[PDB]
CSV table of C-alpha atoms and ligand atoms in Angstrom, one decimal:
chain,number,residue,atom,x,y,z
A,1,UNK,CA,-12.0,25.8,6.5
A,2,UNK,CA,-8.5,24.3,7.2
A,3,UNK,CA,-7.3,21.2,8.5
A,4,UNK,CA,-7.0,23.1,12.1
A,5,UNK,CA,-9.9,24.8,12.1
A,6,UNK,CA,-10.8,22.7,15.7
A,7,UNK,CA,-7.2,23.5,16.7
A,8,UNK,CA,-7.6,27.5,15.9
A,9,UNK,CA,-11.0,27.2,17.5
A,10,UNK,CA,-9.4,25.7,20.8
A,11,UNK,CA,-6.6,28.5,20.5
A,12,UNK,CA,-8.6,31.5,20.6
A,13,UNK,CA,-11.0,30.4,23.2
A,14,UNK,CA,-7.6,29.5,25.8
A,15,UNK,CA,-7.4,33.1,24.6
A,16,UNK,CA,-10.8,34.2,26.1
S,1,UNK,CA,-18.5,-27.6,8.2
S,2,UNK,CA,-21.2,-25.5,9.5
S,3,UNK,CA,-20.1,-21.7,11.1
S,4,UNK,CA,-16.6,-22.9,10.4
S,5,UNK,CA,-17.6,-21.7,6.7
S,6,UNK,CA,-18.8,-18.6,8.4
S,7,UNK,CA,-15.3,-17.9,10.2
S,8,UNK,CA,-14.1,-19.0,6.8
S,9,UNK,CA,-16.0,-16.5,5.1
S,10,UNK,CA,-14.8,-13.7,7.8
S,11,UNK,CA,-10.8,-14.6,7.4
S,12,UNK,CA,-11.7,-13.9,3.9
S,13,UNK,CA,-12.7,-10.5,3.7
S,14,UNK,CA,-10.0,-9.0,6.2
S,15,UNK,CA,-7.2,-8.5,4.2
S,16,UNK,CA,-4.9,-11.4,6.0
S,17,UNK,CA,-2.6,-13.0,4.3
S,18,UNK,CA,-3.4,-17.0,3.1
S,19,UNK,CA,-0.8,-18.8,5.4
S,20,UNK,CA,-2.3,-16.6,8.3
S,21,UNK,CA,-6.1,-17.0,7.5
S,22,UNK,CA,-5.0,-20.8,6.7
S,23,UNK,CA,-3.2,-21.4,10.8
S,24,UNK,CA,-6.2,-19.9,12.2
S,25,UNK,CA,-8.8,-22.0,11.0
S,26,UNK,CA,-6.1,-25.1,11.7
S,27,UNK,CA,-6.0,-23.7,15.5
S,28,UNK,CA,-9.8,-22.8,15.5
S,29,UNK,CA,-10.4,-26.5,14.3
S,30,UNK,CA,-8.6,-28.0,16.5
S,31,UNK,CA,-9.9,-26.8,19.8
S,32,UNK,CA,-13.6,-27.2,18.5
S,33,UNK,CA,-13.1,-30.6,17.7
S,34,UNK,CA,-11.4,-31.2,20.9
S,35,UNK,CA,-13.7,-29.1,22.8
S,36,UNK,CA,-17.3,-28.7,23.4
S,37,UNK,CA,-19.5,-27.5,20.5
S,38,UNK,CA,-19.5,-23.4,18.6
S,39,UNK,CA,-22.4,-22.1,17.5
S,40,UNK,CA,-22.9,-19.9,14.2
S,41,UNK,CA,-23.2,-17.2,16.8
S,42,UNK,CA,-20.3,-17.6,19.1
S,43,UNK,CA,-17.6,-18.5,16.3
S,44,UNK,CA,-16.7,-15.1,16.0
S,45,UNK,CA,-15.6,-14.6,19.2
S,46,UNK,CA,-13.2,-17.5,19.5
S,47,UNK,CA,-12.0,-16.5,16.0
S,48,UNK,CA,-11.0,-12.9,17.1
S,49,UNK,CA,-9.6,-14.2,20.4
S,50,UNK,CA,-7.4,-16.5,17.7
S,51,UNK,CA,-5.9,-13.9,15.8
S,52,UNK,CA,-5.7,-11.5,18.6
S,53,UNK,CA,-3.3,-13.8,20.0
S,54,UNK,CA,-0.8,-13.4,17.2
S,55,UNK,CA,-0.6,-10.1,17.7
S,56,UNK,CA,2.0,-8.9,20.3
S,57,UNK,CA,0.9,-8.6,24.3
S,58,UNK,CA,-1.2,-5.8,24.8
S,59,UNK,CA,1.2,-3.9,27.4
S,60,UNK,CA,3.1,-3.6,24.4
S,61,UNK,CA,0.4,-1.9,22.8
S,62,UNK,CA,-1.0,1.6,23.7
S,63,UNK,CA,2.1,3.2,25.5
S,64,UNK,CA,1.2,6.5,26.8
S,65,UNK,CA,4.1,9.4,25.8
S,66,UNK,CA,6.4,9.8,28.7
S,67,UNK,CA,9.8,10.4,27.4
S,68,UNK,CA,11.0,14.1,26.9
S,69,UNK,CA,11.6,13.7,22.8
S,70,UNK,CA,9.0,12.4,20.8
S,71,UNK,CA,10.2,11.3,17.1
S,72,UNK,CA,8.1,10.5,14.0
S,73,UNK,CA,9.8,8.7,11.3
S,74,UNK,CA,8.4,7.0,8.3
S,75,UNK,CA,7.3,6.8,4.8
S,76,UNK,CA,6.9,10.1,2.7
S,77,UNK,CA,3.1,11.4,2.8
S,78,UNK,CA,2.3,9.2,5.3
S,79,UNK,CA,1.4,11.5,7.5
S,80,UNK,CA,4.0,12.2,9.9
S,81,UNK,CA,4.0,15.9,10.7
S,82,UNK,CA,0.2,15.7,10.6
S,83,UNK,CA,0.0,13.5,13.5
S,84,UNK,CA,2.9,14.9,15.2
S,85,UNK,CA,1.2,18.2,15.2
S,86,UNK,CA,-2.4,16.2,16.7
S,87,UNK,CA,-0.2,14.4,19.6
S,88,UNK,CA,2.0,17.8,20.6
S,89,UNK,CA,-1.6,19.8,20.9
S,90,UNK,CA,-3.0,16.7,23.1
S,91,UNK,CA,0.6,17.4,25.2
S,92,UNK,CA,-0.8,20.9,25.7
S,93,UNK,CA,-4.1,21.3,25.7
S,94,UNK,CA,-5.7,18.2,26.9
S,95,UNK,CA,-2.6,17.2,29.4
S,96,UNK,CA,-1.2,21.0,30.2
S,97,UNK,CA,2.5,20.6,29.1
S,98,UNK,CA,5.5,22.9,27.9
S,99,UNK,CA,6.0,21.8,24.7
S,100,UNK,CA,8.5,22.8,21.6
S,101,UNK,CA,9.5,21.6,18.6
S,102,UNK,CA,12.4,20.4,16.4
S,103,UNK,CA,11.9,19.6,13.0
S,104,UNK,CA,14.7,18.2,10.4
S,105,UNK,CA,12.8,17.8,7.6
S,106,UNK,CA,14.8,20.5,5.2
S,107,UNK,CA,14.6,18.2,2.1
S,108,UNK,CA,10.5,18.7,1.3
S,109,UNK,CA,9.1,21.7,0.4
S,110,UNK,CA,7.6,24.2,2.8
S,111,UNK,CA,7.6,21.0,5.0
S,112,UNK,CA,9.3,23.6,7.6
S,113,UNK,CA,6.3,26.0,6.8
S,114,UNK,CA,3.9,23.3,7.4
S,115,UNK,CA,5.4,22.4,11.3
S,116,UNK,CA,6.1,26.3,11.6
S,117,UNK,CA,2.4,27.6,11.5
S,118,UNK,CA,1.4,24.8,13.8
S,119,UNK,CA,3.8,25.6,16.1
S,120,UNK,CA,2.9,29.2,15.9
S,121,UNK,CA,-0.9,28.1,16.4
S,122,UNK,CA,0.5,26.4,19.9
S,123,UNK,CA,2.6,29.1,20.5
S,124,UNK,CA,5.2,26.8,21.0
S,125,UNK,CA,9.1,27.4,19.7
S,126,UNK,CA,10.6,25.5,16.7
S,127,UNK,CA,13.9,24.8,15.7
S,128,UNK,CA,15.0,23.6,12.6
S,129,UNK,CA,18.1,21.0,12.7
S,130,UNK,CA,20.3,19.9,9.8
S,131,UNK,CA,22.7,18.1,11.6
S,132,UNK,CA,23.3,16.1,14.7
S,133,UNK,CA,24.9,18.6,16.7
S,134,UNK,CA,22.4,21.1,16.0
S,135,UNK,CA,19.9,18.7,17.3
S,136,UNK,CA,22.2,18.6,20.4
S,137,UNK,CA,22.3,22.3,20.7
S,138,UNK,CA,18.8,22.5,20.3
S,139,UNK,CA,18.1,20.2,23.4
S,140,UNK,CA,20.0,22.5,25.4
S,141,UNK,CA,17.2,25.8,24.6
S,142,UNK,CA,14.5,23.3,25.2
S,143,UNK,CA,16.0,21.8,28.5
S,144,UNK,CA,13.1,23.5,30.3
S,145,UNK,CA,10.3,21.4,28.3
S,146,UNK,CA,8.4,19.0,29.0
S,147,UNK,CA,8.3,17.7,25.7
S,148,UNK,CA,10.1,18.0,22.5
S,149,UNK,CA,8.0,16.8,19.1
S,150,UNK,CA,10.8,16.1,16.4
S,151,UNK,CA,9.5,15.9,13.1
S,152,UNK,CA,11.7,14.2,10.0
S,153,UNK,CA,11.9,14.1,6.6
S,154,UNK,CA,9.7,11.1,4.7
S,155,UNK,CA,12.3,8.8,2.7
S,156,UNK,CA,12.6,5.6,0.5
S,157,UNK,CA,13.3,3.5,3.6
S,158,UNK,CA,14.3,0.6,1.2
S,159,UNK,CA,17.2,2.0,0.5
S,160,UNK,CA,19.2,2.3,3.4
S,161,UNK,CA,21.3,5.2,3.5
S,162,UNK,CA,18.3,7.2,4.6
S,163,UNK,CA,18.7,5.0,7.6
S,164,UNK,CA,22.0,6.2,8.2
S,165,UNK,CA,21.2,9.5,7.5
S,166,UNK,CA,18.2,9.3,10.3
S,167,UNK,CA,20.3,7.3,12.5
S,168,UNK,CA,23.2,10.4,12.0
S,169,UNK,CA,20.9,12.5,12.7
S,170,UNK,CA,18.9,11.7,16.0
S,171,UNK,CA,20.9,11.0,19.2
S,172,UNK,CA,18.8,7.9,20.7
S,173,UNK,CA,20.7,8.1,23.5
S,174,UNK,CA,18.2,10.1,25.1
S,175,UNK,CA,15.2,9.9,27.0
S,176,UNK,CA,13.2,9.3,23.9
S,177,UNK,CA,10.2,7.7,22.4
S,178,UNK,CA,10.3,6.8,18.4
S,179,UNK,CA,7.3,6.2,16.1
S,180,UNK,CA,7.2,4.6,13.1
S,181,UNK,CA,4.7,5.8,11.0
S,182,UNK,CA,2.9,3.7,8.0
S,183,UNK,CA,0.1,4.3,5.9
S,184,UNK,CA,-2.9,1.5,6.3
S,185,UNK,CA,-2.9,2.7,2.1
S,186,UNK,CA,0.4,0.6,2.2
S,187,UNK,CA,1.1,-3.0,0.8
S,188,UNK,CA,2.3,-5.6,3.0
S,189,UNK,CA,4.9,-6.7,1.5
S,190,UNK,CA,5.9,-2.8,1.2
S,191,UNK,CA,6.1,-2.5,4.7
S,192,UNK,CA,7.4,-6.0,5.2
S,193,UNK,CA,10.6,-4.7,3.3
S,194,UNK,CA,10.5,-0.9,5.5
S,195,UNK,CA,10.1,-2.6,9.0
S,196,UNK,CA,13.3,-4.7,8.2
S,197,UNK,CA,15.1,-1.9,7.7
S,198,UNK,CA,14.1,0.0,10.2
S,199,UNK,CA,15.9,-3.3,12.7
S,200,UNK,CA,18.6,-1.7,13.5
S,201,UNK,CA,16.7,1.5,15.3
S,202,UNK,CA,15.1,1.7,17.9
S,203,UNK,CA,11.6,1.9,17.6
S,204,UNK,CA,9.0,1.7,20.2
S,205,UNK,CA,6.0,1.7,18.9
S,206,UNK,CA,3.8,1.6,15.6
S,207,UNK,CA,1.2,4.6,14.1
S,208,UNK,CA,-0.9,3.6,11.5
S,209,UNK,CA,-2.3,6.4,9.4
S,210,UNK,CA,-5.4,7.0,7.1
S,211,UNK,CA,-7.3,3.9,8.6
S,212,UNK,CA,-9.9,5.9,7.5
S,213,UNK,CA,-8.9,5.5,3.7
S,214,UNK,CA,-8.4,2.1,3.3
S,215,UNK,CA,-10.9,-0.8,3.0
S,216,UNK,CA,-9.1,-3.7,4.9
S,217,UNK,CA,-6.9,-3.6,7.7
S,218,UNK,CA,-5.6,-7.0,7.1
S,219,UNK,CA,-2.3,-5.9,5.5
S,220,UNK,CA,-1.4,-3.8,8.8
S,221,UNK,CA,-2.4,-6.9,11.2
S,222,UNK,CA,0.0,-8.8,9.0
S,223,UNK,CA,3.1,-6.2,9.8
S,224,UNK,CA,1.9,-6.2,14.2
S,225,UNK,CA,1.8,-10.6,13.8
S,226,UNK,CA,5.4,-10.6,13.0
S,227,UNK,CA,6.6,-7.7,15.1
S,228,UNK,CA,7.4,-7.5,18.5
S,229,UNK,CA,6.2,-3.9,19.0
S,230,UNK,CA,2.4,-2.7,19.4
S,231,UNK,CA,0.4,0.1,18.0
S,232,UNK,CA,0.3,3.9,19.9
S,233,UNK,CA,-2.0,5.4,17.7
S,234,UNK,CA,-3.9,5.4,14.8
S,235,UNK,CA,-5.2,8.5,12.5
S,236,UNK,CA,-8.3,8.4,10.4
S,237,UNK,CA,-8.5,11.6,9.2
S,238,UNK,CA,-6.8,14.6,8.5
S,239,UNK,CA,-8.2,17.3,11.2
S,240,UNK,CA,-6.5,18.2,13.9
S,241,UNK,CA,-6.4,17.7,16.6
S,242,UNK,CA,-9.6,15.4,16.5
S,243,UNK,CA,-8.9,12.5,13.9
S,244,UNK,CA,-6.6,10.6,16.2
S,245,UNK,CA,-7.2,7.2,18.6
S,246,UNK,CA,-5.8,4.7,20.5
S,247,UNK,CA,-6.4,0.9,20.4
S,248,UNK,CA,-5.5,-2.3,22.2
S,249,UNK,CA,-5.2,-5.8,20.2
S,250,UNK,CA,-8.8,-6.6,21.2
S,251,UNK,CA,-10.0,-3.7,19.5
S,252,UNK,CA,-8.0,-3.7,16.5
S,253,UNK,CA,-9.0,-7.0,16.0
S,254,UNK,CA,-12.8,-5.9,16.1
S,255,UNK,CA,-12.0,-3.1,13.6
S,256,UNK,CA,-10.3,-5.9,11.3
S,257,UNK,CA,-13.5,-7.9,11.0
S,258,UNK,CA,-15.8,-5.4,9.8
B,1,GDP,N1,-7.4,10.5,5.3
B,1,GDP,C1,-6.3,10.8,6.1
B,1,GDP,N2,-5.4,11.7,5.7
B,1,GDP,C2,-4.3,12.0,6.5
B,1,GDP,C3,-4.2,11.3,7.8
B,1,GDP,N3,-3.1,11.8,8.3
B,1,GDP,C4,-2.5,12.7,7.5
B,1,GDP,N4,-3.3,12.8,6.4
B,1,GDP,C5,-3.0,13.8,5.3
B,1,GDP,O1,-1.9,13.3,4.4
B,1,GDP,C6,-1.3,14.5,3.8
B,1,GDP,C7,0.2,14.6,4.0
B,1,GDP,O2,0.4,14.5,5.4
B,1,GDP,P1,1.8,14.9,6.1
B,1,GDP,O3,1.7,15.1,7.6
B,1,GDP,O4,2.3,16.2,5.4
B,1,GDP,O5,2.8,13.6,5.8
B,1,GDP,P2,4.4,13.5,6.2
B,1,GDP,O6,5.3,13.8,5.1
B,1,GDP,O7,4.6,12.1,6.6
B,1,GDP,O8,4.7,14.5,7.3
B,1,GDP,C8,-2.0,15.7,4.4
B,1,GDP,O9,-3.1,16.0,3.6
B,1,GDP,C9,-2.6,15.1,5.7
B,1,GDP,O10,-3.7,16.0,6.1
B,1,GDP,C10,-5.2,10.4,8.1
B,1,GDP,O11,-5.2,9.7,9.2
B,1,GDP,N5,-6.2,10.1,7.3
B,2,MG,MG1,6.7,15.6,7.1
């Protein structure tokens, strides 16, 4: 819940 | 009249202004009479072709970021750093460039904060500028980037001194592509006012925020008629890095009639 939740989502899968 | 009461009707509940709505229906006229016959059906069509071609040449709309420095500057709460932060993690993610940022917004609140944690989410560097030669400096670290997203600090645009500050601030010298950024929440003859002052900068193209807030677009078609410049992007909404588009005049014009 955050205005960048897709952004953090994205982040953390480039991550992966 | 028959469907011209229809195309009357339309005009109407865009958000146009009267001279406007009034030449349209004068040019619309005037080729039906002339010219073969419109049907209730096909009115609409010729109508948006009309307006559409008040609206500046769509080359001039919908230019794709190239330059090295990307600058947002506009009215306060627009939505500046918002968007700035959606277009820098398009630059990275979506078309896999080195980007930084610069950000010279020191007068608002945590507005440094705000650009800071997305930067941190992109794992991209950040410096902060106050002044001109900082901003010079800056370009220097960053000479390795691809791009650069500046952010700036939201002013009363009226008044012009913030015009000089921004212009004493930003070397446009450089390779460098500059937003402005209004609110589709804004009154015309608000922006009417802002656009003038921003003549003596140069700006490339247009981004209209919170389409998604407001109930006509009329007031914003008003501002592209009289401008030489077209639209880069819209926002219509406030995730990131999703609520962001594109449009050419075509399909503004669609989204101004409903
Ligand atoms: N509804 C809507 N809200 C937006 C949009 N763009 C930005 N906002 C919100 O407007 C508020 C202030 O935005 P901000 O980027 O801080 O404005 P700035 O001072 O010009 O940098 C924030 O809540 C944003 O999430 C949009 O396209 N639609
Ligand atoms: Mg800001």
């Amino acid at each position: 819940y955050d205005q960048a939740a897709t952004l953090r989502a994205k982040m953390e899968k480039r991550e992966r | 009249p028959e469907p011209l009461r229809k195309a009357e009707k339309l005009l109407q509940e865009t958000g146009i202004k009267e001279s406007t709505k009034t030449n349209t229906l004068k040019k619309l006229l005037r080729f039906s009479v002339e010219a073969g016959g419109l049907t209730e059906e096909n009115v609409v069509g010729k109508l948006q072709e009309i307006l559409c071609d008040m609206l500046p040449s769509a080359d001039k709309w919908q230019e794709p970021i190239h330059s090295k420095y990307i600058v947002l500057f506009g009215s306060t709460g627009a939505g500046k750093t918002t968007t700035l932060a959606k277009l820098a993690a398009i630059s990275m993610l979506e078309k896999h460039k080195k980007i930084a940022f610069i950000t010279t917004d020191t007068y608002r609140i945590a507005a440094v904060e705000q650009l800071k944690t997305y930067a941190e989410l992109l794992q991209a560097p950040l410096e902060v500028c106050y002044t001109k030669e900082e901003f010079q400096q800056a370009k220097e670290l960053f000479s390795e980037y691809d791009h650069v997203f500046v952010d700036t600090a939201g002013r009363n645009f009226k008044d012009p001194q913030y015009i000089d500050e921004l212009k004493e601030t930003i070397p446009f010298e450089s390779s460098i592509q500059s937003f402005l950024v209004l609110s589709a929440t804004a009154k015309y003859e608000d922006m009417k006012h802002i656009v003038k002052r921003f003549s003596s900068v140069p700006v490339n193209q247009y981004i209209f925020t919170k389409i998604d807030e407001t109930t006509s677009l009329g007031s914003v078609f008003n501002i592209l008629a009289e401008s030489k410049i077209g639209v880069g992007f819209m926002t219509n909404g406030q995730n990131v890095p999703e609520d962001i588009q594109t449009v050419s005049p075509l399909g503004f014009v669609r989204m101004l009639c409903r």
